[PDB]
């Protein structure tokens, strides 16, 4: 019953003998190769732990140490970032004049003329302009010399070696047993209150003592070398009390409960800092304090060892009603015995979180001098949207794996799962219908618009000038968010973001940081397109999950596995009935949806947000503001967005942006190369390999590991992999060349 | 009296109408 550490000593012995025998984990691979197919299987099943064995203890041990390996890798990548900022960068000069020096932390050797890629990034330096936004983080951190960057690179290297050693240790010397892993209450109590609570408390601490004073000094105009070191602020406190008088009373308020006396540096202002175009640091510190309090309290909910707390089984069993039978009874047994269920829930939530991060970081810019660095903002939004989409699709993959390999009503029965399984037909019917209806009423409007614009009938269009479709609720909500500070939020001064409105515009260095974003007919059309794409992706993935075990077409589908090519050409033909094929199809639709999302954001920001402002105060946007009138037809997307903005990348040959021109074309090539794998089948290829093998046999030069054509599933997987790489890399080159060139 | 004013409609509207009802009734007929 009680909670304790439980470990085994020396489960596996460190040895090299298993390195020299490829495929030790699976009995079939261990036997050795006859054909080349072997070499592929060896890699495809490398991390399929619960298929190498049946024992849950072994799978969990492997998972734990694999996680340690991943963390060691991440630390090594961080070490590289800090070392490159310290050694091959122009960070100090950029610190001196942030709105003229464009950041760069990678230089190239002069080998074959490639030194042309070392371009003039300002500050007496020649290299590659980076878009990860690391200078903004390092400035918001208080870092002012390259010695601090060196120090953090060394610390990260140490931490990476530590992670690798712990990964070896917990697998070969002290391996925890199943009962240790299966304690979820203590785990949640630690991650809620220990990892997230103590983490943000410690970080709020660092912001109160380092970031806040060093940024106060930097915004005051002081030379970044004549600013005191951070530790001085801790040794001598009069330095702090000069900038914030409240630091004279020094924790007497926090006990005397007169927290009011800290209003110096813990504020609730809202809006941006009109000097750097970022959020007030005095708001972020107070935010982190509040979040830490909330998490530290929330990490005391579940019972571990002292009676007080909540039993998860009790909470789940308590919830049930007259529509759902016995629901939630039997989910604790499931969520503690399958890793795939846990992975699906976790992937779904982390993907959604990443998308939310993208939106919130464009709309309320956290770092100083990030809002006016347009390339970094575009890069960050796009990167995080792609990551979120991929993780959401993996969620479906592992829900399907759970349904095929783990669901079992004979020993672990849950009611809600059973009822959803018992009306899946109606579920899929209604979702299918709503996607068809949503597709007619959003893309159809575009087709109507194109045809009315080509037929010389613009008064019959769907636009702000002819037939208006104003999103009344969105306008109503942002009007409520405009009037909020002072009426429904008396403690706030400015509202949360500048996109809500109120007529407030923030500029930095003659550039536009933020201003109110206008919603119109075009915004209405684009958002309904987005609803359409998300609904279709959901239909494909949920159909794959709900029918993973059986169908009216193939009534014993679970016996064929999770990843199989087909069940033959009979029954009419049954290619791609497996759930793996549904994941394979959903990847294309996720690509479609995310691509449209990033195109909508990129065109809208340049058209109505970004630009340059004059001393008289007349804003000139990068594009002329043509999103309201050209986004409503398809021809306007092809003409005013793709054709007009690809100019920067198709003209980079000879400049320092020529690598983007090379990658544009390479990515087009890789995309078109995948269609060969996607459009064909392996019978043709094996028959061609036959004749090539004959030719080799004619000269006693034929190989002993007989060459085969790829698998059916491998053909599909190579196809989708190259398709995604080609498409995403094309958009990557286009975006980066375009945004870097104009500004 | 405008010649396309008559031929474009009926070849565009009624010819396919009659031909589609025609072929539907024929193709779903069990002799």
């Amino acid at each position: 019953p009680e909670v304790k550490i439980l470990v085994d000593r020396d489960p596996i012995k460190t040895s090299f003998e298993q390195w020299a025998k490829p495929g030790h984990f699976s009995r079939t691979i261990a036997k050795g190769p006859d054909t080349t197919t072997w070499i592929w299987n060896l890699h495809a099943d490398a991390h399929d732990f619960d298929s190498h064995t049946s024992d849950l203890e072994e799978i969990s041990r492997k998972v734990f140490s694999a996680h340690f390996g991943q963390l060691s890798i991440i630390f090594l990548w961080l070490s590289g970032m800090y070392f490159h900022g310290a050694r091959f960068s122009n960070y100090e000069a950029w610190l001196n004049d942030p709105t003229h020096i464009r950041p760069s932390a990678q230089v190239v050797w002069p080998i074959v003329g490639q030194e042309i890629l070392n371009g003039d990034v300002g500050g007496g330096f020649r290299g590659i302009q980076i878009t990860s936004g690391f200078f903004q983080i390092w400035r918001a951190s208080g870092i002012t010399s390259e010695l601090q960057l060196y120090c953090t690179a060394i610390g990260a290297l140490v931490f990476a070696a530590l992670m690798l050693f712990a990964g070896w240790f917990h697998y070969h010397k002290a391996a925890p047993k199943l009962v240790w892993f299966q304690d979820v209450e203590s785990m949640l109590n630690h991650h809620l209150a220990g990892l997230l609570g103590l983490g943000s408390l410690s970080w709020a601490g660092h912001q109160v003592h380092v970031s806040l004073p060093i940024n106060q000094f930097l915004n005051a105009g002081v030379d970044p070398k004549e600013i005191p070191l951070p530790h001085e602020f801790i040794l001598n406190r009069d330095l702090l009390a000069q900038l914030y008088p409240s630091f004279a009373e020094g924790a007497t308020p926090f006990f005397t409960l007169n927290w009011s006396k800290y209003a110096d540096f813990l504020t609730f202002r809202g809006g941006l800092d009109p000097l750097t175009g970022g959020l007030w640091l005095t708001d972020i510190a107070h935010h982190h304090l509040a979040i830490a309090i909330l998490f530290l309290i929330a990490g005391h909910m579940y019972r571990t060892n002292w009676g007080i707390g909540h039993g998860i089984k009790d909470i789940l069993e308590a919830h049930k009603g007259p529509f759902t039978g016995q629901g939630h009874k039997g989910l604790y047994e499931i969520l503690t015995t399958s890793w795939h269920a846990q992975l699906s829930i976790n992937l779904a939530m982390l993907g959604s979180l990443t998308i939310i991060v993208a939106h919130h970081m464009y709309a309320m810019p956290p770092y100083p001098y990030l809002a006016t660095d347009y390339g970094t903002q575009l890069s960050l939004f796009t990167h995080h949207m792609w990551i979120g989409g991929f993780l959401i699709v993996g969620a479906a993959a592992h829900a399907a794996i759970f349904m095929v390999r783990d669901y079992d009503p004979t020993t672990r029965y849950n009611d809600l799962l059973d009822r959803v399984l018992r009306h899946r037909d109606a579920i899929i019917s209604h979702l299918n219908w709503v996607c068809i209806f949503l597709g007619f009423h959003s893309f159809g409007l575009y087709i109507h618009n194109d045809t009315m614009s080509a037929l010389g009938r613009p008064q019959d269009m769907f636009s702000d000038t002819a037939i208006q479709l104003q999103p009344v609720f969105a306008q109503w909500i942002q009007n409520t968010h405009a009037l909020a500070p002072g009426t429904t939020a008396p403690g706030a001064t400015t509202s949360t973001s500048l996109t809500w409105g109120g007529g407030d515009l923030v500029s930095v260095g003659g550039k536009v940081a933020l201003l109110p974003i206008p919603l119109g007919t075009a915004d209405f059309l684009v958002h309904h397109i987005h609803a359409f794409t998300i609904h279709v992706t959901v239909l494909i993935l949920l159909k794959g999950v709900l029918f993973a075990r059986s169908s009216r077409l193939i009534p014993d589908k679970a016996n064929l596995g999770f990843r199989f090519p087909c069940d033959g050409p009979g029954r009419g033909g049954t290619c791609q009935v497996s759930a793996w094929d549904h994941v394979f199809l959903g990847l294309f639709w996720m690509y479609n949806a995310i691509s449209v999302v990033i195109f909508h954001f990129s065109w809208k920001m340049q058209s109505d947000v970004w630009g340059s402002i004059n001393d008289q105060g007349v804003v000139t946007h990068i594009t002329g503001g043509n999103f309201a009138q050209s986004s409503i037809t398809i021809n306007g997307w092809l003409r005013d967005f793709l054709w007009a903005q690809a100019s920067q990348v198709i003209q980079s040959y000879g400049s320092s942006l020529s690598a983007y021109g090379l990658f544009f074309l390479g990515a087009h090539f890789v995309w078109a190369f995948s269609l060969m794998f996607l459009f064909s089948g392996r019978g043709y290829w094996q028959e061609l390999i036959e004749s090539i093998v004959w030719a080799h046999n004619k000269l006693k030069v034929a190989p002993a590991t007989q060459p085969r054509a790829l698998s059916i599933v491998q053909g599909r997987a190579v196809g989708v992999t190259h398709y995604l790489l080609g498409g995403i890399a094309t958009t990557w080159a286009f975006f980066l060349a375009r945004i870097i060139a104009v500004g | 009296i405008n010649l396309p004013s008559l031929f474009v409609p009926l070849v565009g509207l009624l010819f396919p109408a009659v031909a589609m009802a025609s072929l539907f009734l024929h193709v779903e007929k069990r002799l």
């Binding site: - | 009296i1 405008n2 004013s5 008559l6 409609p9 009926l10 509207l13 009624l14 109408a17 009659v18 009802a21």
Partner: protein
């Protein structure tokens, strides 16, 4: 137990779930009127041939004699035409 070889329709579920089988709620003066006046359109071949040829009649008619306020294709051009890149 829902299997009875004698009555098959109850075993395979041939019910009418929403039919009524109640008497007519349209009292006969109203029904009288309709089934008197609405009869001649109740033969299949009759209705089909009539509908086709009458719809075609109305379409050819309203197409040959539509006015300019309706169809810009009828009002013709009202401007002098341009010359092409060389020709015209």
């Amino acid at each position: 137990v829902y299997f009875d070889l004698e009555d098959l329709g109850n075993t395979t579920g041939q019910w009418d779930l929403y039919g009524s089988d109640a008497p007519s709620p349209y009292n006969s003066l109203q029904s009288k009127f309709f089934e008197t006046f609405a009869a001649p359109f109740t033969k299949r071949g009759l209705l089909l041939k009539f509908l086709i040829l009458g719809g075609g009649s109305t379409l050819a008619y309203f197409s040959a004699t539509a006015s300019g306020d309706i169809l810009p294709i009828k009002k013709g051009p009202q401007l002098p035409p341009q010359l092409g890149p060389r020709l015209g």
